[PDB]
Coordinates of C-alpha atoms and ligand atoms in Angstrom, one line a residue:
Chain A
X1 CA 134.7 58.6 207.1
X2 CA 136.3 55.1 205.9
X3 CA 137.4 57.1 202.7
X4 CA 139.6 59.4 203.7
X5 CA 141.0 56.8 206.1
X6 CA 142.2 54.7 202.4
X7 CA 143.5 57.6 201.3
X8 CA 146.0 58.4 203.3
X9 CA 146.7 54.9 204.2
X10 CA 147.4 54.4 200.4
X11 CA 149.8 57.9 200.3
X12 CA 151.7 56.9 203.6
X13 CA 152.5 53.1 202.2
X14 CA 153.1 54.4 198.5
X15 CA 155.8 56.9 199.7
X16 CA 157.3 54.3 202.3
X17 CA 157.8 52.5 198.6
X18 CA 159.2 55.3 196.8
X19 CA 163.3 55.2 196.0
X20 CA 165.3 58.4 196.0
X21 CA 166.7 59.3 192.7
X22 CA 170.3 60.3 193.0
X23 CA 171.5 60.4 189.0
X24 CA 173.9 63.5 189.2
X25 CA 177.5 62.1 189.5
X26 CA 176.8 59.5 186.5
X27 CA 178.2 58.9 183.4
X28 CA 176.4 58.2 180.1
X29 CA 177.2 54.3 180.9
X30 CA 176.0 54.3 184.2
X31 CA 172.9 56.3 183.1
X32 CA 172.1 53.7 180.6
X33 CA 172.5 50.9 183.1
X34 CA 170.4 53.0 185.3
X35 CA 167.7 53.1 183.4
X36 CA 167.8 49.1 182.4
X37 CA 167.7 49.0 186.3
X38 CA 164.3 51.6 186.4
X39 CA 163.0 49.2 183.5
X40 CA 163.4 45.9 185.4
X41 CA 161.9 47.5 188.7
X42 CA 158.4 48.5 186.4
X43 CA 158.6 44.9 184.7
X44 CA 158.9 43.3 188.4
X45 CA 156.0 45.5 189.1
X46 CA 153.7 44.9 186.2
X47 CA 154.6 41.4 186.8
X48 CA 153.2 41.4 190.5
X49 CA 150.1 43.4 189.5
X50 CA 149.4 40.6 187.0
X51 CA 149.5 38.6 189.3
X52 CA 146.8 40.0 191.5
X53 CA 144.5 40.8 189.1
X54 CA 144.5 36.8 188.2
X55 CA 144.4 36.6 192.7
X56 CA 141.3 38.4 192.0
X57 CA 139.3 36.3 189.1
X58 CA 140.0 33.3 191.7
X59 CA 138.7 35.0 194.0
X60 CA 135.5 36.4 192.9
X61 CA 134.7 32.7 191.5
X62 CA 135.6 31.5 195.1
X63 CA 132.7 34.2 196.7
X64 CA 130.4 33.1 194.1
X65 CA 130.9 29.4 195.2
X66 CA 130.8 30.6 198.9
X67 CA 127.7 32.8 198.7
X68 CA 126.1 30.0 196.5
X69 CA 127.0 27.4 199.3
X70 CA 125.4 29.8 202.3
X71 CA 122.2 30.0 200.2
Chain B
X1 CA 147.8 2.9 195.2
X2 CA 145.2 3.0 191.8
X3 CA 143.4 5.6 193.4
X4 CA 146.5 7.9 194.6
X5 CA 147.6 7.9 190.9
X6 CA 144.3 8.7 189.5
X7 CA 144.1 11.9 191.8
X8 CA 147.6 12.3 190.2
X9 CA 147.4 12.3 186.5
X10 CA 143.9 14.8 187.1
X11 CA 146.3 17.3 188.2
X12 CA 149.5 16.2 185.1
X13 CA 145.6 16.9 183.0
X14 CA 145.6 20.8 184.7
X15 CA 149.7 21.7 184.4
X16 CA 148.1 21.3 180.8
X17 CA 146.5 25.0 181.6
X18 CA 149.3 26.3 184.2
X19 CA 151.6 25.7 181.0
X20 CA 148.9 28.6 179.2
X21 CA 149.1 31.6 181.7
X22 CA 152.7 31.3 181.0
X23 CA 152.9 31.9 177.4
X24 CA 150.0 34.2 178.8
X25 CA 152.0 36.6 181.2
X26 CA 154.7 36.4 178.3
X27 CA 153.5 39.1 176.8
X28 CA 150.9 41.1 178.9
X29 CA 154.3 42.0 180.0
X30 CA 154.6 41.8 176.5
X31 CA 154.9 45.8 177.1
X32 CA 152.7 47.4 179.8
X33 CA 156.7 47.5 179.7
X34 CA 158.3 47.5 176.9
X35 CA 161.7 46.9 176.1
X36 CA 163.9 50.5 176.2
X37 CA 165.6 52.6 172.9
X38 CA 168.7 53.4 174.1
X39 CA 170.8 54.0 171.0
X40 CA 171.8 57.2 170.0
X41 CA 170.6 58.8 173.2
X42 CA 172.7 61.5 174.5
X43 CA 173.4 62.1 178.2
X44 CA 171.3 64.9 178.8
X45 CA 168.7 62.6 177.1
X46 CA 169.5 59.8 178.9
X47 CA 169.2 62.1 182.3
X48 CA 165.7 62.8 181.4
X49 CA 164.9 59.4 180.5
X50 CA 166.1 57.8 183.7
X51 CA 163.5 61.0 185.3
X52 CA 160.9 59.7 183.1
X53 CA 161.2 55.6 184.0
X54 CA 161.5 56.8 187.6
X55 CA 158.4 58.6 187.4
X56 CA 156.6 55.7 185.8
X57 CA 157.7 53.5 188.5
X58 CA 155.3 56.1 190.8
X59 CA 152.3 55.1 188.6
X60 CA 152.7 51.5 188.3
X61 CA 153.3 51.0 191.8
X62 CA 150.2 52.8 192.5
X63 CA 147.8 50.9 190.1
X64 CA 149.4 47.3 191.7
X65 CA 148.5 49.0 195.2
X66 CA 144.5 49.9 193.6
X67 CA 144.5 46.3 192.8
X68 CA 146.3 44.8 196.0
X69 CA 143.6 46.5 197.7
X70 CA 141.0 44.8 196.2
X71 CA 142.5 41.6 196.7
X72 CA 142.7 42.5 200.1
X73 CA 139.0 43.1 200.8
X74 CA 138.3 39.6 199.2
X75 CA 140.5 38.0 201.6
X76 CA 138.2 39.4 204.6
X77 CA 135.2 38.8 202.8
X78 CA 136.4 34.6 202.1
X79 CA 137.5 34.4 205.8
X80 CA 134.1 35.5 206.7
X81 CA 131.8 33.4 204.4
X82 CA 134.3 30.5 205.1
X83 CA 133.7 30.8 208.7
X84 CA 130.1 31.0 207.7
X85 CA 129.1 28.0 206.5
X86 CA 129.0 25.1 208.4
X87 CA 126.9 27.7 210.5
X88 CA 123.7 27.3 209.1
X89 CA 164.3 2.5 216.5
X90 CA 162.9 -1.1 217.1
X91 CA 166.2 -2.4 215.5
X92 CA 167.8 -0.8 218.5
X93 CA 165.6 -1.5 220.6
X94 CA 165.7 -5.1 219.9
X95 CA 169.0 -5.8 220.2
X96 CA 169.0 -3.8 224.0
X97 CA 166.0 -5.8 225.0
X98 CA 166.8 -9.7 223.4
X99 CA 170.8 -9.0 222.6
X100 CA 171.8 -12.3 220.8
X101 CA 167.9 -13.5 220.4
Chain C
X1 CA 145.6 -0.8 198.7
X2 CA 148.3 -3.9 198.4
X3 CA 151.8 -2.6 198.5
X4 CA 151.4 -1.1 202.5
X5 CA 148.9 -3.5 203.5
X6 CA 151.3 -6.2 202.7
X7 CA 154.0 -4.7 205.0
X8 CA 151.7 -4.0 207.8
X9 CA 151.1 -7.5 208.2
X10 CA 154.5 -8.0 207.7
X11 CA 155.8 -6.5 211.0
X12 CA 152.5 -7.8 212.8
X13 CA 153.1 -11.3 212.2
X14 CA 156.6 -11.0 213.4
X15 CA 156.2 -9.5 217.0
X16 CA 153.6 -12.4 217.2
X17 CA 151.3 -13.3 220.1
X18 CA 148.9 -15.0 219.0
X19 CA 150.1 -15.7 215.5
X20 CA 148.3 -14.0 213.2
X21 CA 145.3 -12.1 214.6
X22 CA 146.6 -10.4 217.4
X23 CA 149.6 -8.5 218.7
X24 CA 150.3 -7.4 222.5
X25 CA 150.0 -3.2 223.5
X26 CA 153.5 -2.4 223.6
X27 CA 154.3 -4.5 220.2
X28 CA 151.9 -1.7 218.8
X29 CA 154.8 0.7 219.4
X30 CA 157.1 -1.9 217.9
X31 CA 155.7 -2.2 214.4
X32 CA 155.2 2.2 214.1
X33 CA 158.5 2.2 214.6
X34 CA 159.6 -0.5 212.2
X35 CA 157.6 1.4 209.2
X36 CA 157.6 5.0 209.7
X37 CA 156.1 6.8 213.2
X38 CA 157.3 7.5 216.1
X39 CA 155.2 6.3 219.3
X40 CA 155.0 9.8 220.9
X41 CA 152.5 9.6 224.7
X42 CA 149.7 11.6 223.1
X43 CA 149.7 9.2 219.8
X44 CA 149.9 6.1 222.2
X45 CA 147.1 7.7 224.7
X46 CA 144.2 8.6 221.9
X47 CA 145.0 5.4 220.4
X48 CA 144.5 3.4 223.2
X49 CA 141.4 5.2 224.6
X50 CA 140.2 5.2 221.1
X51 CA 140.6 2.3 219.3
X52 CA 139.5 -0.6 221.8
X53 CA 141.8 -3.5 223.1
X54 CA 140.7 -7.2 222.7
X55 CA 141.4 -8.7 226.0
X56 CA 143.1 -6.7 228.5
X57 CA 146.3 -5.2 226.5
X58 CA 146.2 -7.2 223.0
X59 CA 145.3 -5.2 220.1
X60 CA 143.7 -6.9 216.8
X61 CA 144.0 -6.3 213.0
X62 CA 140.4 -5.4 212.0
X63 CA 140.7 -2.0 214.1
X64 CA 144.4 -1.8 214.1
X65 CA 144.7 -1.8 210.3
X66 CA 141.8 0.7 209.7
X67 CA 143.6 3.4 212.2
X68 CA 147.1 2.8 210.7
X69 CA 146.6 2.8 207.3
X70 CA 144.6 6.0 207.4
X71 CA 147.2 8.4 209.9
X72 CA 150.5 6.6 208.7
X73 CA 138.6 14.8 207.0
X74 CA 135.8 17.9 206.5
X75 CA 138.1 19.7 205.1
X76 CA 139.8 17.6 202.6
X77 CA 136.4 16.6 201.3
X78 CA 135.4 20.0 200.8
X79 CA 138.0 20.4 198.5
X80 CA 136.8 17.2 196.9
X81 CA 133.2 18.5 196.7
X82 CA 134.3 21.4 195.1
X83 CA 136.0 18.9 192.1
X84 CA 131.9 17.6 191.1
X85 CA 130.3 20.8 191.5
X86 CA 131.3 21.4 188.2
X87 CA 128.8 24.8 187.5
X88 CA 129.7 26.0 190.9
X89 CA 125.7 26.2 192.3
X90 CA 126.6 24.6 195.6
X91 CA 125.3 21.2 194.8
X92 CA 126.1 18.1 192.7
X93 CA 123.3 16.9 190.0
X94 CA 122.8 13.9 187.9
X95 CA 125.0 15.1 185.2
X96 CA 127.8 16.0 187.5
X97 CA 127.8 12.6 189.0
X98 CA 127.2 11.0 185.7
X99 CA 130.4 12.8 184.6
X100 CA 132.1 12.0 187.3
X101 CA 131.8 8.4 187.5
X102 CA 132.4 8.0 184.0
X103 CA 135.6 9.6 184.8
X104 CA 136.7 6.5 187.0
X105 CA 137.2 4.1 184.0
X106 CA 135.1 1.8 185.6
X107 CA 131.9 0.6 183.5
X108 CA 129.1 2.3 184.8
X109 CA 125.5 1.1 183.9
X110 CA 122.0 3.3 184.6
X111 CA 121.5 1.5 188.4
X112 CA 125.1 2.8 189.4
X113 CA 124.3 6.5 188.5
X114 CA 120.5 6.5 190.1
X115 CA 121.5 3.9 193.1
X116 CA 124.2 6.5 194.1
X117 CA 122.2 9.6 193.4
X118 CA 119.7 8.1 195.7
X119 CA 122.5 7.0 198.5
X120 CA 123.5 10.3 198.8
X121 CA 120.4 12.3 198.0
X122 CA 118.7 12.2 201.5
X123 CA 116.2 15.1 201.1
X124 CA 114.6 13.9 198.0
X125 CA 115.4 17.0 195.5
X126 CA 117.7 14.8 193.3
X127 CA 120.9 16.3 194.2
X128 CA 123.5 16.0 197.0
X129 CA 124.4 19.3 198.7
X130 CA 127.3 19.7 200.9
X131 CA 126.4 18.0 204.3
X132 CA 124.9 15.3 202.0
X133 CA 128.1 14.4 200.9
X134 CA 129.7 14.7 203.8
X135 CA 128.0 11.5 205.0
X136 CA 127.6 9.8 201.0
X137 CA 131.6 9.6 201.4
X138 CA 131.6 9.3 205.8
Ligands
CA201 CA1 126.4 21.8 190.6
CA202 CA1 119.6 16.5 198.4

């Protein structure tokens, strides 16, 4: 039903997402700069996520007030 | 002009609690990611390393996605109950018009 | 307000007709310009059909002055409701608008908090819901 629907929703954007890793031709230098790089992208993504799950709080405290309104 | 300012400072009163989320998100990021050990790592080390980050950038972007989808499904529920309840220049015009006058 | 209201009356008594009471239709245009709007046929239209005129084309500041000062809403007093409903049930109590109006500086004695309670409580259950409100601040 609407589940499996998600679920390949969710694999279909996720791999859109996904980066090829090409690390073969590097250096030791560029390797290390490469993984500062791989760092900053899981940072800038923890960063975002935090950022939703605080979206969210608000959220479920504005459906409270909503739902509390309508009644 | 009172009243405008009044509505002003009760917002200077909340940049009070902006100003806490951000030593806050400080440090949740505090790891979640933390900072890399590069020292002493040798290339083939540094080759699996680069593997392993890469790999973690695949589950991180998946648990913001689980969470972006429940932000998602609040949106369409708000729009809904939102929609829900009230349910239940004369300078140069001056001088064209009166010249000297 | 003192600083605007000042300067409306400024530019009114200027593009005189009267002297100071009433100013002609197209010296409406006039003084938007002068301060800070521009006369666009739709703003002119629901203004005139609106907002009467006093003889034939002669608008007068007690009308004038109420629709100027206020464009140069539900909505915004939703947001505003929101601000007193402190616990988030959906409707404002005593002690909501007791903390409230203490808030304003202003001295506020046991007749201001029940006189307003009782303004804006229309149904009788001692509290203001959201369409109450609406009208307590119309
Ligand atoms: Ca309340
Ligand atoms: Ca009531």
């Amino acid at each position: 039903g609407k589940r499996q629907t998600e679920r390949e929703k969710k694999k279909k954007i996720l791999a859109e997402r996904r980066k090829a890793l090409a690390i073969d031709h590097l250096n030791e230098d560029q390797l290390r700069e490469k993984a500062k790089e791989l760092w900053q992208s899981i940072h800038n993504l923890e960063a975002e996520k935090f950022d939703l799950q605080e979206k969210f709080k608000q959220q479920k405290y504005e459906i409270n007030v909503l739902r509390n309104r309508i009644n | 002009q009172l009243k405008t300012l009044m509505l002003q400072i009760a917002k200077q009163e909340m940049e009070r609690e902006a100003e806490e989320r951000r030593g806050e998100k400080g440090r949740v990021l505090r790891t979640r990611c933390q900072p890399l050990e590069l020292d002493g790592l040798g290339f083939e080390e540094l080759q699996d390393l680069c593997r392993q980050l890469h790999a973690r950038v695949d589950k991180v972007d998946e648990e913001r996605y689980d969470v972006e989808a429940k932000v998602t499904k609040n949106i369409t529920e708000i729009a809904d109950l939102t929609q829900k309840i009230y349910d239940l220049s004369a300078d140069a015009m001056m001088q064209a018009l009166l010249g000297t006058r | 307000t003192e600083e605007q209201k000042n300067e409306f009356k400024a530019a009114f008594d200027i593009f005189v007709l009267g002297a100071d009471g009433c100013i002609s239709t197209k010296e409406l245009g006039k003084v938007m310009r002068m301060l800070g709007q521009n006369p666009t046929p739709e703003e002119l239209q629901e203004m005139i059909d609106e907002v009467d005129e006093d003889g034939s084309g002669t608008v007068d500041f007690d009308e004038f002055l109420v629709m100027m000062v206020r464009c140069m809403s539900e909505e915004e007093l939703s947001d505003l409701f929101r601000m007193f409903d402190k616990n988030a049930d959906g409707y404002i109590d005593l002690d909501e608008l007791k903390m409230m109006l203490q808030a304003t500086g202003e001295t506020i004695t046991e007749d201001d908090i029940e006189e307003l309670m009782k303004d804006g409580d229309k149904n009788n259950d001692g509290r203001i819901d959201y369409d109450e409100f609406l009208e307590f601040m119309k």
